[PDB]
Design an enzyme around this catalytic site. Sequence first.
Site, PDB file in Angstrom:
ATOM      1  N   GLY A  73       0.939  -1.211  -0.062  1.00  0.00           N
ATOM      2  CA  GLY A  73       0.016   0.051   0.038  1.00  0.00           C
ATOM      3  C   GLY A  73       0.828   1.288   0.010  1.00  0.00           C
ATOM      4  O   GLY A  73       2.045   1.062  -0.209  1.00  0.00           O
ATOM      5  N   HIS A  91      11.532   2.484 -10.228  1.00  0.00           N
ATOM      6  CA  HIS A  91      11.709   1.250  -9.297  1.00  0.00           C
ATOM      7  C   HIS A  91      10.195   1.100  -8.465  1.00  0.00           C
ATOM      8  O   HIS A  91       9.020   2.094  -8.240  1.00  0.00           O
ATOM      9  CB  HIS A  91      12.267   1.832  -7.852  1.00  0.00           C
ATOM     10  CG  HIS A  91      13.686   2.043  -8.037  1.00  0.00           C
ATOM     11  ND1 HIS A  91      14.628   2.859  -7.254  1.00  0.00           N
ATOM     12  CD2 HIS A  91      14.434   1.887  -9.134  1.00  0.00           C
ATOM     13  CE1 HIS A  91      15.624   3.065  -7.872  1.00  0.00           C
ATOM     14  NE2 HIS A  91      15.795   2.406  -8.866  1.00  0.00           N
ATOM     15  N   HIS A 113       2.428   5.814 -15.596  1.00  0.00           N
ATOM     16  CA  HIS A 113       2.474   7.018 -14.318  1.00  0.00           C
ATOM     17  C   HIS A 113       4.160   7.104 -14.282  1.00  0.00           C
ATOM     18  O   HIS A 113       4.556   8.378 -14.356  1.00  0.00           O
ATOM     19  CB  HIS A 113       1.817   6.705 -13.282  1.00  0.00           C
ATOM     20  CG  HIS A 113       1.897   7.650 -12.112  1.00  0.00           C
ATOM     21  ND1 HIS A 113       1.082   8.608 -11.919  1.00  0.00           N
ATOM     22  CD2 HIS A 113       2.887   7.982 -11.099  1.00  0.00           C
ATOM     23  CE1 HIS A 113       1.451   9.355 -10.979  1.00  0.00           C
ATOM     24  NE2 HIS A 113       2.653   9.139 -10.561  1.00  0.00           N
ATOM     25  N   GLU A 114       4.847   6.109 -13.735  1.00  0.00           N
ATOM     26  CA  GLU A 114       6.588   6.160 -13.584  1.00  0.00           C
ATOM     27  C   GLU A 114       7.250   6.480 -14.526  1.00  0.00           C
ATOM     28  O   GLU A 114       8.123   7.320 -14.521  1.00  0.00           O
ATOM     29  CB  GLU A 114       6.945   4.934 -12.881  1.00  0.00           C
ATOM     30  CG  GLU A 114       6.038   4.595 -11.622  1.00  0.00           C
ATOM     31  CD  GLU A 114       6.358   5.575 -10.499  1.00  0.00           C
ATOM     32  OE1 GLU A 114       7.048   6.380 -10.236  1.00  0.00           O
ATOM     33  OE2 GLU A 114       5.156   5.699  -9.522  1.00  0.00           O
ATOM     34  N   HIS A 117       7.401  10.036 -14.841  1.00  0.00           N
ATOM     35  CA  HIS A 117       8.382  10.847 -14.357  1.00  0.00           C
ATOM     36  C   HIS A 117       9.894  10.600 -14.792  1.00  0.00           C
ATOM     37  O   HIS A 117      10.395  11.514 -14.898  1.00  0.00           O
ATOM     38  CB  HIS A 117       8.179  10.182 -13.025  1.00  0.00           C
ATOM     39  CG  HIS A 117       7.465  10.653 -12.021  1.00  0.00           C
ATOM     40  ND1 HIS A 117       6.908  11.995 -11.866  1.00  0.00           N
ATOM     41  CD2 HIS A 117       6.556  10.005 -11.149  1.00  0.00           C
ATOM     42  CE1 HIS A 117       5.819  11.978 -11.195  1.00  0.00           C
ATOM     43  NE2 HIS A 117       5.452  10.813 -10.529  1.00  0.00           N
ATOM     44  N   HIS A 123       3.669  15.874 -11.251  1.00  0.00           N
ATOM     45  CA  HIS A 123       2.312  15.598 -11.383  1.00  0.00           C
ATOM     46  C   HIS A 123       0.921  16.534 -11.732  1.00  0.00           C
ATOM     47  O   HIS A 123       1.474  17.743 -12.002  1.00  0.00           O
ATOM     48  CB  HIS A 123       1.755  15.309  -9.532  1.00  0.00           C
ATOM     49  CG  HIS A 123       2.500  14.105  -8.824  1.00  0.00           C
ATOM     50  ND1 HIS A 123       3.104  14.050  -7.871  1.00  0.00           N
ATOM     51  CD2 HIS A 123       2.521  12.964  -9.662  1.00  0.00           C
ATOM     52  CE1 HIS A 123       3.485  12.920  -7.439  1.00  0.00           C
ATOM     53  NE2 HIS A 123       3.215  12.200  -8.734  1.00  0.00           N
TER      54      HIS A 123
END
Length: 162
Positions: A73, A91, A113-114, A117, A123
Site C-alpha cells: 500500500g 523502481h 505513471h512512473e 516521471h 504531477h
Amino acid sequence: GPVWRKHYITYRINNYTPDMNREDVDYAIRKAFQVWSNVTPLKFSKINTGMADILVVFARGAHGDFHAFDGKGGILAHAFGPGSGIGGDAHFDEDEFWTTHSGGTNLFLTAVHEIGHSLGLGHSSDPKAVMFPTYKYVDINTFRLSADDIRGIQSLYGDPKE
Ligand SMILES: CC(=O)c1ccc(-c2ccc(CC[C@H](O)CC(=O)O)cc2)cc1
Ligand SMILES: [Ca+2]
Ligand SMILES: [Zn+2]
Ligand SMILES: [Zn+2]
C-alpha cells in the site's frame, strides 16, 4: 527542467516480480513505454546486457537510493527524472501485488505513471490524467492518455514527426 537529450532511449529490466510471469511483466512495461512513444518522437528499446538509460527494478523497503519503500500500500513505485547516475530509473515496490488486470495493483497503469516521471513529468491536478498522484483502475482496453498528459509530454519533447 532536465530532459532526455536524445530520442533513442534504452531500458533494461533489472529483476522480475514473482506476481506475474516474465511475458506479462515484459508486455506491461513495453506497452507503458508505447503509450508515451505514441504521442512524441521518442523511441524505446529493451536491452539485456550493458548499461541502459533506464533501469526498471523491483525492490522492497530500503534499497540503496535514500528512498526506502513502505510495505504493501501507500507508495507503489517511484522514479527519477533525467540526469546523471540513477536518473531515469524506475523502481516498483515489490510489497505490492502486481497484476495484468485488476486483482491487485495493475503494473501497466503504474508503469505509465512512473515512465512519465522518468521522462521528466511532474504531477497533474486533472483527475482524468495518468500523472494524477493517486492510483485508480481503468480498463486496459479502454485506456487512453488524458489531453492534459499529452500536452505535458509534448511540451518537453514535441509531437510525432511527419
Ligand atoms: C486515469 C488513468 O488511466 C490513471 C493511470 C495511472 C494512475 C496512477 C497514479 C499513481 C500511481 C502510483 C504513484 C506512486 O505510488 C508514487 C509516485 O510515483 O508518485 C500509479 C498509477 C492514475 C490514473
Ligand atoms: Ca508500498
Ligand atoms: Zn528506489
Ligand atoms: Zn507520481
